[PDB]
PDB file of C-alpha atoms in Angstrom:
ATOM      1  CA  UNK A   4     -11.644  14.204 -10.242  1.00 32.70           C
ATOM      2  CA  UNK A   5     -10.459  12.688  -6.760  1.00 32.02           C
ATOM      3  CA  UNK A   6     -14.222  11.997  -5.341  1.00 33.66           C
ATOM      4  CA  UNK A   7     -13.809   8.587  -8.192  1.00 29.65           C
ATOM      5  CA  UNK A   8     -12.694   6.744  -4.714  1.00 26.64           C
ATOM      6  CA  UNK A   9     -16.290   6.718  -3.924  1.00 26.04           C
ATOM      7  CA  UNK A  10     -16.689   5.182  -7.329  1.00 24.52           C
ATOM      8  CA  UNK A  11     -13.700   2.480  -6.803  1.00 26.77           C
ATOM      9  CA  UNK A  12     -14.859   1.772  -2.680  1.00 28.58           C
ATOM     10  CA  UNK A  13     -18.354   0.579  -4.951  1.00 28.01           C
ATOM     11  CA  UNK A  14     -15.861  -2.003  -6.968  1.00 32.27           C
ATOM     12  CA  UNK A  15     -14.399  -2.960  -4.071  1.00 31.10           C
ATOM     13  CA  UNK A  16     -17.311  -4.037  -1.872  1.00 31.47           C
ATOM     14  CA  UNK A  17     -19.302  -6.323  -4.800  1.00 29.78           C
ATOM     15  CA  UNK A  18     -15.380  -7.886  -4.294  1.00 26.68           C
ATOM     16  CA  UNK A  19     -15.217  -8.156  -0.667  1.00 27.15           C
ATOM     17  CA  UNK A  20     -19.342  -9.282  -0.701  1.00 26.88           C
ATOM     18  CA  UNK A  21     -19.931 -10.760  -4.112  1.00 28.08           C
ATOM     19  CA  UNK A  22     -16.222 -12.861  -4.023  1.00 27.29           C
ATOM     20  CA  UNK A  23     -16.315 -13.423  -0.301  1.00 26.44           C
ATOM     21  CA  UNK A  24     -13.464 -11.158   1.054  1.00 24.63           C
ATOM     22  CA  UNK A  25     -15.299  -9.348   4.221  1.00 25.66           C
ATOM     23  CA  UNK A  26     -13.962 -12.931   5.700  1.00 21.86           C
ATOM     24  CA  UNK A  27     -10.697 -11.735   5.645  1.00 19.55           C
ATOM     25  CA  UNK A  28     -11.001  -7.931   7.098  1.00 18.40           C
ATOM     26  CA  UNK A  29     -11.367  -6.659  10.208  1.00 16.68           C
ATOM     27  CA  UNK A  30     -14.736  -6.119  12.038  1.00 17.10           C
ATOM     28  CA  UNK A  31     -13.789  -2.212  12.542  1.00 15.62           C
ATOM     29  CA  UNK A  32     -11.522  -0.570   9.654  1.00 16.49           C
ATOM     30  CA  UNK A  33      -9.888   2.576   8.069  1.00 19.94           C
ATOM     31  CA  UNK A  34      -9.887   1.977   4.404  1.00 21.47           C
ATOM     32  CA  UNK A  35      -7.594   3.283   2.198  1.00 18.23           C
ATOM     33  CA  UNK A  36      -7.796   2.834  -1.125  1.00 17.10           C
ATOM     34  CA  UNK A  37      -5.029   3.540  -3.679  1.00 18.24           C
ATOM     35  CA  UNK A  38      -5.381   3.742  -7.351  1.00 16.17           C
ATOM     36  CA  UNK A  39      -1.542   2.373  -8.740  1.00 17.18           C
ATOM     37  CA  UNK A  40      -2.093   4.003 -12.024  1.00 20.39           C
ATOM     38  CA  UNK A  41      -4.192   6.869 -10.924  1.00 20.62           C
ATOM     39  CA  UNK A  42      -1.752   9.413  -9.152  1.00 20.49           C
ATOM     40  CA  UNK A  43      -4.249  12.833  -9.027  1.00 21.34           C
ATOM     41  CA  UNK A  44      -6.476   9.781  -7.016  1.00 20.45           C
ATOM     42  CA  UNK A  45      -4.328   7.832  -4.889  1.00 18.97           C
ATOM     43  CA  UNK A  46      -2.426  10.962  -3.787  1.00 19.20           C
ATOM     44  CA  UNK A  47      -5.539  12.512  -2.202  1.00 20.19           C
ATOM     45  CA  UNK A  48      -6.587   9.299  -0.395  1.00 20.08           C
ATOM     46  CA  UNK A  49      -2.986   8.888   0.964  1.00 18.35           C
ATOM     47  CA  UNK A  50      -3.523  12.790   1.785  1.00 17.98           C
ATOM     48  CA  UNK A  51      -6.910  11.630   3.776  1.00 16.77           C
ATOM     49  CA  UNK A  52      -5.140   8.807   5.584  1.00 14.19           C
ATOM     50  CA  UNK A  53      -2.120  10.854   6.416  1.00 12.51           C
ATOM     51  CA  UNK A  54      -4.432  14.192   8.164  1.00 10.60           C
ATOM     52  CA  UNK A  55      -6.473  11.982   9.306  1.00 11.54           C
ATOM     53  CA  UNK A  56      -4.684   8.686  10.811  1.00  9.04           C
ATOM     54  CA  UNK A  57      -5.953   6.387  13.176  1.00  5.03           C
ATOM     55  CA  UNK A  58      -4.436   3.535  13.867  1.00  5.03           C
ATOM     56  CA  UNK A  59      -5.820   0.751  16.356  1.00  4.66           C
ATOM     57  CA  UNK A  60      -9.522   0.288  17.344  1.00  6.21           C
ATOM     58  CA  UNK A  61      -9.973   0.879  13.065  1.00  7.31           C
ATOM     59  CA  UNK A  62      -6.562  -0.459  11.577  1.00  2.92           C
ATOM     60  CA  UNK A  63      -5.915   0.468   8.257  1.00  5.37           C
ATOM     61  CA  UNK A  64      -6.937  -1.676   4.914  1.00  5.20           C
ATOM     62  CA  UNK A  65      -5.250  -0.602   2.042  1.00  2.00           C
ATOM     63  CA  UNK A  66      -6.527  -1.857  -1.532  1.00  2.00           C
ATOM     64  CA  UNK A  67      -4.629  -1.380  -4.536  1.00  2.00           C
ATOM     65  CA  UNK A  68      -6.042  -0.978  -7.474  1.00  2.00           C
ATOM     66  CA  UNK A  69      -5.176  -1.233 -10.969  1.00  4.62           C
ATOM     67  CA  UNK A  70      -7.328  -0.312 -14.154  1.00  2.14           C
ATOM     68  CA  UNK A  71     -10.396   0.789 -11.808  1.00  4.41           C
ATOM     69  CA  UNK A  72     -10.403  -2.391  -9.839  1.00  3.40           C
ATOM     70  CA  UNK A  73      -8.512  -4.533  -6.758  1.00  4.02           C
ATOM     71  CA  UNK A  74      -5.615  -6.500  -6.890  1.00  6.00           C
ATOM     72  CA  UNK A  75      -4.400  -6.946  -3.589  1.00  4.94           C
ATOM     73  CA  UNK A  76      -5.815  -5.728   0.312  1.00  5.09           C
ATOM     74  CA  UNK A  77      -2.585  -5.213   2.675  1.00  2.11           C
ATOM     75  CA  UNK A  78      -4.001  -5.869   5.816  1.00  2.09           C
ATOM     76  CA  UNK A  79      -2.533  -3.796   8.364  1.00  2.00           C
ATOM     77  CA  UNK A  80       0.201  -4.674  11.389  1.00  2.00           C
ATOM     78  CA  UNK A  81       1.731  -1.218  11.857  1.00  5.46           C
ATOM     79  CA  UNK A  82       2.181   2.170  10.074  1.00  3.57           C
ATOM     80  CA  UNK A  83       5.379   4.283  10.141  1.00  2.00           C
ATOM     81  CA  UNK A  84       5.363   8.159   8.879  1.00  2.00           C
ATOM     82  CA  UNK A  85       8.848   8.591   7.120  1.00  2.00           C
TER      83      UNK A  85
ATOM     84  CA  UNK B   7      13.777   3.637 -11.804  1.00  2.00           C
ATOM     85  CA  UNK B   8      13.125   1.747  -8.723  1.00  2.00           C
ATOM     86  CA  UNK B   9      16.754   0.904  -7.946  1.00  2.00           C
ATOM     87  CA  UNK B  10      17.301   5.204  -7.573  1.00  2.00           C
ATOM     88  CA  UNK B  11      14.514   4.921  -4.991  1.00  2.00           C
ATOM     89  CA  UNK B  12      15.717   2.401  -3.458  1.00  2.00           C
ATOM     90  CA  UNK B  13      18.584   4.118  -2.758  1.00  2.00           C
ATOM     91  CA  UNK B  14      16.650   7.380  -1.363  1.00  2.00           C
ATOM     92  CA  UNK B  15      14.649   5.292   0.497  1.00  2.00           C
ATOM     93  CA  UNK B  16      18.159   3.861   2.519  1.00  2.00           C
ATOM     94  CA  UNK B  17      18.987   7.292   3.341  1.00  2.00           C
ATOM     95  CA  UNK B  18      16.021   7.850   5.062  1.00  2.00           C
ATOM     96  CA  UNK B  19      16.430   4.264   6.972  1.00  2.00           C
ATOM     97  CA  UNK B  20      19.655   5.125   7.459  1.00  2.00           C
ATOM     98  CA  UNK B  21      20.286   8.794   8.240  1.00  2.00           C
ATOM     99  CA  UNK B  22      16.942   9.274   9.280  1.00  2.00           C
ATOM    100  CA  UNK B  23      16.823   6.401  11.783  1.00  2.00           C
ATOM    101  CA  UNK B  24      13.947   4.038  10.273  1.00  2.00           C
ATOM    102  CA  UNK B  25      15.626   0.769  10.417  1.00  2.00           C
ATOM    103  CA  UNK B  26      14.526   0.767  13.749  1.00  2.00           C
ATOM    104  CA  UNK B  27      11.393   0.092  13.143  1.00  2.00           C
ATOM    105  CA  UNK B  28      11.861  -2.292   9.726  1.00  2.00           C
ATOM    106  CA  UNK B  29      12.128  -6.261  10.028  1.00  2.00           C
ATOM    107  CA  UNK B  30      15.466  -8.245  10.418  1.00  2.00           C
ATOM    108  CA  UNK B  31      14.511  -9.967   6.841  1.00  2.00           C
ATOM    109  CA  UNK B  32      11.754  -8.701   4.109  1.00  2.00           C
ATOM    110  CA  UNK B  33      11.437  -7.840   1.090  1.00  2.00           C
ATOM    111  CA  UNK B  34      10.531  -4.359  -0.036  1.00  2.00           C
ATOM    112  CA  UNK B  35       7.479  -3.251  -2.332  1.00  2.00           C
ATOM    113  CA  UNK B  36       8.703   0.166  -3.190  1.00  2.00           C
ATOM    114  CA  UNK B  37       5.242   1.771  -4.391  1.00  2.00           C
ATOM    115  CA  UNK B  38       5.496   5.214  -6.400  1.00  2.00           C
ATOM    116  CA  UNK B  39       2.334   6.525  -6.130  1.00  2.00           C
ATOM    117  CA  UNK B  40       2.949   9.535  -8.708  1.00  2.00           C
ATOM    118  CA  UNK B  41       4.683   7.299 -11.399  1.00  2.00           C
ATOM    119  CA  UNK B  42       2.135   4.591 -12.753  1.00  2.00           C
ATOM    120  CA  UNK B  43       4.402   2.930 -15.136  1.00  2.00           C
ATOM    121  CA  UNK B  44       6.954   2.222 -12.314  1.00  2.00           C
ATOM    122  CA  UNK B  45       4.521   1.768  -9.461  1.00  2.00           C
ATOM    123  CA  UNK B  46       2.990  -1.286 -11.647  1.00  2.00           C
ATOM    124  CA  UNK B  47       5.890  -2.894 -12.700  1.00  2.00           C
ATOM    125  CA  UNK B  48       6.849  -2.817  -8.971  1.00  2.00           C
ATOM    126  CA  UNK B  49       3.624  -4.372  -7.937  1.00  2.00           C
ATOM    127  CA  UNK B  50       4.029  -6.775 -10.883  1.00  2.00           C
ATOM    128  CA  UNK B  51       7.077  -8.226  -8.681  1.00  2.00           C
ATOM    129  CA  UNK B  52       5.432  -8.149  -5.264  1.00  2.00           C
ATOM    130  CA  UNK B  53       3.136 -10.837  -7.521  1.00  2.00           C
ATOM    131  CA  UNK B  54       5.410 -12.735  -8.418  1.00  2.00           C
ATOM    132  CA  UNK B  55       6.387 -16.265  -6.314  1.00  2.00           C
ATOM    133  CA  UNK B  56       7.385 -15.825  -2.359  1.00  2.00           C
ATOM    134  CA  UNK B  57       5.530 -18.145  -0.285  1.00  2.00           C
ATOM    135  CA  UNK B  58       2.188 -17.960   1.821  1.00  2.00           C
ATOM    136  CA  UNK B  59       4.925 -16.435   4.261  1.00  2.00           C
ATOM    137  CA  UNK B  60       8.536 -16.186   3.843  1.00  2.00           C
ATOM    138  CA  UNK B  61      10.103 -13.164   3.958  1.00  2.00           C
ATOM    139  CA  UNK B  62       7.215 -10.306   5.187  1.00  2.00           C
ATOM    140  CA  UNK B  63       6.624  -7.350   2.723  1.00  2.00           C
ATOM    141  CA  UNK B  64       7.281  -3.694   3.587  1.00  2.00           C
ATOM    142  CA  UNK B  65       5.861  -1.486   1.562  1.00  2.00           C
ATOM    143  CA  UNK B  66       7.565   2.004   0.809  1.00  2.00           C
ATOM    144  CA  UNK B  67       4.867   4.569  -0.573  1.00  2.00           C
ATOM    145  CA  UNK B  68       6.008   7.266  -2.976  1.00  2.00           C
ATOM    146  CA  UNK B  69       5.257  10.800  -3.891  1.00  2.00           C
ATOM    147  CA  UNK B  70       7.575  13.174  -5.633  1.00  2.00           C
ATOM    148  CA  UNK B  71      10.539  10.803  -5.866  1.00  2.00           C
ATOM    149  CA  UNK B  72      10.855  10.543  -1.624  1.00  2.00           C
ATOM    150  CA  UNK B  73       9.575   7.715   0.204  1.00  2.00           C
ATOM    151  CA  UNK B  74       6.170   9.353   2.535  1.00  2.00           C
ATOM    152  CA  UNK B  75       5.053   6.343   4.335  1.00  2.00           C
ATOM    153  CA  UNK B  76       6.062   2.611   5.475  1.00  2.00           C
ATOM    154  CA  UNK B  77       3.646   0.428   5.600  1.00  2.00           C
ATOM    155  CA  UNK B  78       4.269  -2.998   7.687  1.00  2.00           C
ATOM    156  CA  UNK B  79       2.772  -5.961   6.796  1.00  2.00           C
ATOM    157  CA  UNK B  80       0.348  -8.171   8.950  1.00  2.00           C
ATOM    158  CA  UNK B  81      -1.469 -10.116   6.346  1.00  2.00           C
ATOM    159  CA  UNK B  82      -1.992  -9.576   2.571  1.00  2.00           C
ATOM    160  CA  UNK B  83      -5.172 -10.564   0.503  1.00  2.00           C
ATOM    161  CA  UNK B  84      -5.198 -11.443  -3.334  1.00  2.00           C
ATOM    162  CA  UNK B  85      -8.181 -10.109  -5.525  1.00  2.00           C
ATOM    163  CA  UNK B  86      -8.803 -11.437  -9.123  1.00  2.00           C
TER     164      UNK B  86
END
């Protein structure tokens, strides 16, 4: 059930540590992690990020993931609510 | 599927006044976040070849067929 995020930010630190990554984030954050092929999951963590927004001061780091682990980190410039 | 969303995504630029904030030139990542075999092929593209730079990615987050967030590029990270 959405909670597996805490599961998934696990995979996503031995990447950032582990495959030297933390190089390329920011030294304060908001991360937002997003499960592709997981909807009941990423639709809760967009949910988070949405009540629950700050920007600057701890921009947002979104990491998509695919088959339980990331692909790509969109490092954040700006955010616009549609 | 995509190509339908693209097009409900322009009304919202559009009559909805979004383009405002939305580069001169990009190229759009339109991200379903509710349909899995069309969010993936859609990533599947954004992999494909633009280079280091180029044209900046926008990327137009999903839910319910209705675009709920924009997200504007400032850097982008590979993992594999």
């Amino acid at each position: 059930p959405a909670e597996r995020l805490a599961e998934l930010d696990g995979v996503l630190m031995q990447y950032l540590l582990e495959a030297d990554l933390l190089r390329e984030l920011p030294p304060t954050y908001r991360l937002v992690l997003l499960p592709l092929d997981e909807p009941e999951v990423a639709a809760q963590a967009l949910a988070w990020a949405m009540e629950a927004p700050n920007p600057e001061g701890w921009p947002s780091v979104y990491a998509l993931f695919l088959q339980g682990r990331p692909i790509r980190l969109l490092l954040l410039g700006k955010e616009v609510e549609v």
